[PDB]
Design a protein around this ligand. Structure first.
Ligand SMILES: NC(=O)c1ccc[n+]([C@@H]2O[C@H](COP(=O)([O-])OP(=O)(O)OC[C@H]3O[C@@H](n4cnc5c(N)ncnc54)[C@H](OP(=O)(O)O)[C@@H]3O)[C@@H](O)[C@H]2O)c1
Ligand SMILES: NC(=O)c1ccc[n+]([C@@H]2O[C@H](COP(=O)([O-])OP(=O)(O)OC[C@H]3O[C@@H](n4cnc5c(N)ncnc54)[C@H](OP(=O)(O)O)[C@@H]3O)[C@@H](O)[C@H]2O)c1
Ligand SMILES: COc1cc(/C=C/C=O)ccc1O
Lengths: 324, 331
């Protein structure tokens, strides 16, 4: 059994405005051995920085003194689990460290796409966009679609999925750079900077003169109130996230417009993952669906990457490359 | 043609905040009971008028000051330029708040072995609302837990019975002890409470639903909706029927707990009874026999005469109605 140094990113204390100083790099030794258990021993390759991670920094929560955990991409080294062997590439819950021992996780089968994608378009955020838009929104060709946080990991896919259906798509984001990207790279019909608008309702009016069939909700609050008054009869709202979290005032619109507003969790849809891959892999290979990610290098960079994600300093999907 | 005086309830002006009696008045005019030439109009004598909460929204599509209020009623046909209706037919539909109306292009009533007043409630729009809302929007299943607000009202008292009939566990809220007693002794709710006597509505619902709520039939909105959200089960459903606590506010109360839709995967869906009238033949064919057999029951509050109508309508918003509020026009 190989015994190796193992760098780790440790939660120093519960978090307040998350800062780099609440994490800490620690250097330990690890013996790369299956414990008599069903554990998988992996070398981590990529780590996802995901918004839900913030709530886990307070007290299912992270433990101070212990490594941070989250979605990543890793190589199997040893396995007591029948489903995985040495050399398998996998994605799932792993540790923020060079090597992890994982308890009883998806086998990667296509190595022809950059492997970082299995933290985003081919991982949890991609499955999130697929379940939310294709299942929860019941979309039809020619319908109008608004996407909140449109340049994030999830929303940049929702808009391309809608485009591919023949929908008219508008997105909102937090900078000129992000807006230009929405239009020029993701093929959104329109986009605006929400920070610039003094009246979100009037602005959605201008982009949707006939109303909105589908809102993919990443935000909540005032944005949700502005959407509600601009929805079409029988409009659908897929409640994915509420990252901005402020009272919502316009729920009466659910009756007058007969709107179905429905929350969902990506874990409930994992039986549809092979089918999602079946659709999106050849779209990617043909350049008809695209993805933009931010890749920080080395674990020494992971605290900075996680903190910057919480503010939106990243462009699209934030990833840390642990090792090549 | 026959000429008779025609008493009318007139809306005096648009309303801010709560409506009061003096926002309406009684006017007497002369009406000629005849079908306007070339029209397919129907001339009716009004018998029962429904008081319905959505009528508040029309006091700010909207009613016109100086003109009769209009709403759902039950009437007897006197003359008709429409071949579908004959003199002597009984109908229910939109009519005027008056002794007689000329109605331009209505459901023809066939069963008169039930009180005619029931076609303002259990056999009219509110009855269809409870059925469409509960049977269609809530996708209910045997053994599920069901919470209904404004539960002793026109729509609520039916939702609760339909839920018990399905073998659901059912809890109702109402705004007085008398209404709570009625929920439990007449309508067969498993439990009920007076929302005004609860210090903390969330803690109240947790007491009545130790494992959470599968289905919320929402008639009320506001702080009640927030207390329900944190008590919902996984894949809970909320059929958004009404938000009566909000109707008389100049600014709505903010709803704060929507993040629960995500953690609990909740479907919260609004609906309008109008969209579901294709199901009305079916509803009547199921419910009428159940009423005649005493398996479904009804409580209505019948005010007497058009002079009572302003009071009857205003009292909805104070909880003065016990069960479905009706005005008997004529005797
Ligand atoms: N239900 C589920 O199963 C599930 C699964 C995955 C993710 N989610 C949720 O989906 C949402 C988006 O996830 P993601 O992975 O795609 O995140 P992300 O967009 O990659 O990162 C966060 C983004 O949200 C926007 N944002 C941050 N603060 C904001 C604010 N105050 N107001 C408006 N926009 C703000 C940012 O873009 P701007 O430049 O536009 O500000 C930022 O890029 C999150 O709320 C997340 O928790 C839910
Ligand atoms: N979506 C549709 O197609 C449709 C059709 C019909 C009705 N509706 C809606 O369904 C609901 C019930 O209608 P209904 O005909 O059955 O009325 P109802 O319950 O017969 O009468 C109204 C009742 O609302 C309650 N109430 C009034 N103000 C309140 C407040 N501030 N907070 C809490 N409760 C209050 C009262 O009962 P308590 O004494 O118990 O407080 C009062 O008796 C309404 O919200 C209505 O707008 C919707
Ligand atoms: C018929 O009953 C209602 C209708 C509406 C909405 C009507 C919009 O066309 C709101 C509340 C009600 O009680």
């Amino acid at each position: 059994a190989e015994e190796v140094s193992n760098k780790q990113v440790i939660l120093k204390n519960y978090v307040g405005y998350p800062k780099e100083s609440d994490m800490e790099i620690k250097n330990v030794t690890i013996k790369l051995k299956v414990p008599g258990s069903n554990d998988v021993v992996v070398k981590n390759l990529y780590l996802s920085c995901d918004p839900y991670m913030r709530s886990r920094m307070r007290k299912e929560s992270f433990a101070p003194g212990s490594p941070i955990t989250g979605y990543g991409v890793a190589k199997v080294l040893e396995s007591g689990d029948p489903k995985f062997q040495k050399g398998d590439l996998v994605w799932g819950m792993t540790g923020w460290e060079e090597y992890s021992i994982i308890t009883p996780l998806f086998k990667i089968h296509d190595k022809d796409v950059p492997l970082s994608y299995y933290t985003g378009i081919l991982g949890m955020p991609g499955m999130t966009a697929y379940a939310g838009f294709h299942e929860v929104c019941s979309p039809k060709k020619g319908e109008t679609v608004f996407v909140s946080a449109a340049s994030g990991a999830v929303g940049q896919l929702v808009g391309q999925f809608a485009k591919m259906l023949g929908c008219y798509v508008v997105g909102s984001a937090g900078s000129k750079e992000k807006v230009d990207l929405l239009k020029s790279k993701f093929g959104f019909d329109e986009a605006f900077n929400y920070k610039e608008e003094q009246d979100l309702s009037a602005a959605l009016k201008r982009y949707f003169p006939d109303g909105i069939d589908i809102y993919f909700e990443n935000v909540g609050g005032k944005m949700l109130d502005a959407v509600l008054v601009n929805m079409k009869l029988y409009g659908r709202i897929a409640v994915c996230g509420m990252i901005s979290q402020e009272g919502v005032h316009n729920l009466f619109c659910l009756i007058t417009k007969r709107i179905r507003m429905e929350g969902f969790l990506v874990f409930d849809y994992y039986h549809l993952y092979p089918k999602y891959l079946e659709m999106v892999i050849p779209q990617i290979k043909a350049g008809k669906v695209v993805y933009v990610e931010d890749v920080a290098h080395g674990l020494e960079s992971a605290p900075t990457a996680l903190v910057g994600l919480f503010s939106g300093r990243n462009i699209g999907k934030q990833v840390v490359m642990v090792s090549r």
